[PDB]
Structures are given as structure tokens and as C-alpha cells.
């Protein structure tokens, strides 16, 4: 919601300055679409997606199924990206995702640090790190 | 212990290539000392440390106290760093910390992505993102 005190303007989302950073930034903003068919276009054939340390999805089919399933029980109401940066082929997003459980109407604020690996502008790897204590309940 | 399928040589720990990266790498390795007095020497006076999204510690005194408390209940048995990188004044560590609860002798693997901010070679901010649902039991 509001800017954390440790937020550094040097690495703000609006300061994204490589084509990979801009692609990832556009991707995480697209999560509010709740549309697995839209989102899967960002992924390479050889790809991976994981909420650490839950079982990963490898391959674009498995990733698409995971996202599709997520969006049947949960709405991504908001994504606020505080930092974005990149280094050695990896892109990092420090952000908050707001998830709303569809059956209960309850919403959850997850503080996430995600790492992305892109190959020719397509997502080859995506791993989100965050507290899963409420993620289970949010199913 | 074992290298993950998604480990990328281009961002491997052995390839750290800025002063900040090397300092941060040295710091996380030093975690296995379990020595708050040793570890606090890496932090600036104006600083913070947080296991997201537990309450943060601001200021070198609060950080030292938090680390001291930690090491009275937990041993950091191993730290394995898969990736290190940096961008826009932030350093990122994708790693695994193995923690052993001292009263139970139970050990835990935490998959962690951490971000570090440094000023004149000193830690100005440290935020670790990982699953905390074993952390409650661990600490």
C-alpha cells in the first residue's frame, strides 16, 4: 500500500532501465489480470515457476496449470513493486502482492522478493520468496 | 547441500565481482559463527534487519540484540549461497540457511532470498525473505 521506510528511490520500479527489467515489471503488474492465458505468453517453453519451497512447476504446461488453478481460488487484487533491479541475467523484484481468497473474501498482504531469469525476453525461471504461513489459508 | 536445477553459473557466489558483493558474501558465510558481537561489526549505526514480515529491527543496537537473541536459541549450521548479484546499490543473495534449534536439536532448511543495502561498506539494510512456518517452531 504505502512506501516502506527502507524503499530506495535508486531502485524504484519507475527507474527500470534494462529491457529485462521492463519486461518483468510489466509481467508482475499483469498478475492483477488473474488470467493464466494472458500470463503464460510471457513464459518460455523451457521454464519454471515456484513459490519457495513448495514443489516447483517445470515446463510451460505445468506453469500454466498452476496459474490457472491459483486464479480459481484467489484474486490478485494489487501488486506494488518497491524495487526492481537486475544482475548477471537475473531480475529481482521486491514487492507486495495483495491476494483475496475468493470463497471467503479475505485479503492477504504478502511481502515478496522474486527472482526472474529471462531468455530472449521470455521467462525461463520465476521463484517467489515470501512467508507462507497465511498462504495456505489463502489457498 | 546440493546445487539446485535452476542454479546459474553466471551469478554463482564464486563469481562475486564488486566490493559490496564480496562483503555481503563474507557476511552470510560468517553467520555460522553464531557470534552477534562479530557479526554486528558489519552494520552501520543507521541500519535495519528484518525477517519478512516480522517486526523489523532499526538501529545497530536493536540488530545486535536481535542477532544475540537468535543465537541463544538457534545455531546457523550452514549457509549455502547459490546466487549473488547486485543492482542500484542493493545486493541479493539466493541461498539456503540450515538452522538447528538448540533446545530440540532439530534442524531446518530455509530457502532464502535476501537483499542487502550497503553504505561505505557497511550494512544499512538487510531483509531476508523466506517461508516462516517452520521458523516459528525453529526459534
Q: How far is B34 from B100, CA to CA, in rounded Å?
A: 11
The answer to whether the Cβ–Cβ distance between A6 and B125 falls below 8 Å is: yes
Residues 6+ apart with CB under 8 A from A103: A73
Give dist(CA A10, CA A16) in Å, integer: 10
Does A29 participate in catalysis according to the annotation? no
For residues A59 and B91, give the distance between their C-alpha atoms in angstroms, rounded to a whole number.
29
Order of all β-strands in the sheet with B74-87: B57-58, B48-51, B122-130, B107-119, B90-101, B74-87
Q: Is B14 helix (H, G, I), strand (E, B) or coil?
A: helix
Report how this structure was experimentally obtained. Answer: X-ray
Element housing B123 (H / E): strand B122-130
Q: Provide the 8-state DSSP code for A81.
A: E
Burial of B103 (0-12, 13-18, 19+ CB in 10 A): exposed
Reported structure resolution in angstroms: 2.2
Distance CA B82, CA B95 (A): 5
Contact B76, B34 (CB under 8 A): yes
Tell me, yes or no, if B97 is annotated catalytic.
Answer: yes
With a CB cutoff of 8 Å and minimum separation 6, the contacts of B80 are B1, B95, B96, B98
As a whole number of angstroms, the distance between CA B9 and CA A57 comes to: 21
Residues across chain B: 139
Cβ-nearest to B131 among A15, A117, A132: A132
Q: Where are the alpha helices (DSSP H) in A12-117?
A: 19-30, 36-39, 60-73
- DSSP string over B25-43: HHHHHHGGG--HHHHGGGB
Chain B nearest C-alpha distance from A29 (Å) = 20
DSSP lists the bridge partners of residue A85 as: A92
The CATH code of the domain that includes A85 is 3.10.450.50
- Check A111 against B52: CB less than 8 A apart: yes
In the three-class reduction of DSSP (H, G, I as helix; E, B as strand; rest coil), residue B8 is classed as coil
**Total domains, chain A:** 1
B39 min Cα distance to partner chain A (Å): 21
Helices (H) and strands (E) in chain A, counts: 3, 6
Residue A100 near residue A74, CB atoms below 8 Å: yes
Residue closest to B81 by CA, chosen among B121, B122, B29, B6: B29
Phi then psi for residue B122, to 5 deg, are -120, 145
Nearest CB partner across the interface for B111, out of A53, A86, A109: A53
**Interface size between A and B, measured as CB pairs under 8 A:** 110
CA distances for A82 relative to A7, A11, A37, A96, B108, angstroms: 6, 8, 26, 8, 30
Pairing of strands B90-101, A57-58: unpaired
Element (H, E) at B122: strand B122-130
Bridge partners for B62 per DSSP: none
Which chain A residues are closer than 8 Å to B112 by Cβ?
129
Q: Is A27 left (phi over 0), alpha (psi -120 to 50) or beta?
A: alpha
Q: Is the CB of A129 less than 8 angstroms away from the CB of B117?
A: no
> Do the Cβ atoms of B1 and B81 come closer than 8 Å?
no
Q: Does B8 touch chain A (CB under 8 A)?
A: yes
Owning domain of residue A75: 1-139
Amino acid at each position: 500500500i504505502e512506501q516502506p521506510r527502507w524503499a530506495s528511490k535508486d531502485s524504484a520500479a519507475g527507474a527500470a532501465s534494462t529491457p529485462d527489467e521492463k519486461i518483468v515489471l510489466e509481467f508482475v503488474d499483469a498478475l492483477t489480470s488473474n488470467d493464466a492465458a494472458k500470463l503464460i505468453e510471457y513464459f518460455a517453453e523451457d521454464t519454471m515457476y515456484q513459490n519457495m519451497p513448495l514443489p516447483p512447476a517445470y515446463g510451460r504446461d505445468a506453469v500454466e496449470q498452476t496459474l490457472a488453478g491459483l486464479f480459481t481460488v484467489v484474486s490478485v487484487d494489487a501488486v506494488e513493486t518497491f524495487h526492481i533491479g537486475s544482475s548477471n541475467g537475473l531480475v529481482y523484484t521486491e514487492r507486495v502482492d495483495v491476494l483475496r481468497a475468493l470463497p471467503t473474501g479475505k485479503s492477504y498482504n504478502f511481502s515478496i522478493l522474486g527472482v526472474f531469469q529471462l531468455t530472449e525476453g521470455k521467462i525461463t525461471g520465476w521463484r517467489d520468496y515470501f512467508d507462507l504461513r497465511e498462504f495456505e489459508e489463502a489457498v
